[PDB]
């Protein structure tokens, strides 16, 4: 299940930046 | 009024400029997680939880402490839903609509667990970590002190919502229904009746006090049997992170701050979409699908919140999309007249898209209702 929450930190960070 | 990036950047400054130095130590096991976290966090002080999370995963080899942080917040956000604690229930099948269990009092210390969850959610917002408990948008509205509306009823209780539609749009004097300003409530086999207004035990609902009776019944449905437990959650949350820090957010932005985003594969979204009164080749939908391509994934996932009620997909993709009756795919239809806006029904994952005149009209009026309506 790391791929679950890890994909959500990555997408969120790319929007902000 | 401003964008989500500014709201995010301002909230990050508040947590940065109000953080205590050093770290907290929290040690847990795979099997003890909920009840090690309950003991250590509820024994620390509210302001202490504001210092760096130094999570100890007993049994593992602690290297990357940001990943164990992301891991601990996610795994615990699912361990609070354990039926053994009786804290939460679902208003539908397949885990649709997470709401507080009104029978949580069967857990004698339940208010202490809800104060624990309030702290745990505040720690996630304070530390930029994400959860996946699955709180509904009306739940976030209560954190923002927004009053739940009639539209929110269709999201959490469509059958209760249809009863209020029927009351509002029908002369109930013809149809012959005795209604009074009261409401029953069965919690643990104990049936109790709440008075909506002063002396409503005796007052009929007529054509005159109807619209009032509608403002009352809606507010009761969002508070009944959960007054205790909601107060415990907000009190524990306010201890760690002040609730005023969320004053600029809306309910959809607050879910983003707590759940994060995914890139929404719409090669999947497009093929898992059904329609009323439209074909896949109607120039309306050929416009709609091209709009959502030019969207960034900010507003793509905001469109998901507007139509489905949340920003989180199921693990099966858009094919395993669930409504208030079970599996329910994404749907668009011909509903609304030319000078309308996109309205939605989250219980059916339905987008009431009126047949617009031009792509210029439809890119313009869609994003407004997505960004300014609910
Ligand atoms: C989360 C997901 O499904 N996909 C995804 C797409 C892009 C990114 N990163 C950026 O956009 C910068 C992460 C995850």
Numbering used by the authors:
A (entry chain B): 1 to 17
B (entry chain A): 492 to 865
From the reporting publication:
Here, we report a general and rapid method for discovering α-helically constrained (Helicon) polypeptides that cooperatively induce the interaction between two target proteins without relying on previously known binders or an intrinsic affinity between the proteins. We show that Helicons are capable of binding every major class of E3 ubiquitin ligases, which are of great biological and therapeutic interest but remain largely intractable to targeting by small molecules. In addition to possessing increased stability and membrane permeability, Helicons are capable of binding large, flat protein surfaces that are inaccessible to targeting by small molecules, and Helicons have been developed to target a range of PPI targets in cells and in vivo. Characterizing Helicon-E3 co-structures and mechanisms of action, we identified new binding sites for α-helices on the E3 surfaces, as well as potential probes of the disease-linked E3, WWP123,24, highlighting the generality of our approach against this therapeutically important target class.
First, we focused on the NEDD4-like E3 ligases, which make up approximately a third of the HECT family. These include WWP1 and WWP2, which each consist of four tandem WW domains and a catalytic HECT domain at the C-terminus that transfers ubiquitin from a bound E2 first to itself and subsequently to the target substrate. Group 2 Helicons, the pan-HECT group including C73, bind both HECT domains, while Group 3 Helicons, the WWP2-HECT group including C72, bind only the WWP2 HECT domain (WWP2HECT). We next solved the crystal structures of five Helicons, four in complex with WWP2HECT representing all three groups of HECT-binding clusters, and one from Group 1 with WWP1HECT. These structures revealed three distinct Helicon binding sites on WWP2HECT. In all of the structures, we found that the HECT domains adopted similarly closed (inhibited) conformations. The WWP2 proteins in the co-structures with H301, H305, and H308 share a low root-mean-square deviation (RMSD = 0.5–0.8 Å) and are shown overlaid. Consistent with their ability to impact the catalytic activity of WWP2HECT, H301 binds near the E2 interface, while H305 and H308 may restrict the conformational change involved in activating this domain. While the WWP2 linker region is mostly helical, it is linear where it overlaps the H308-binding site.
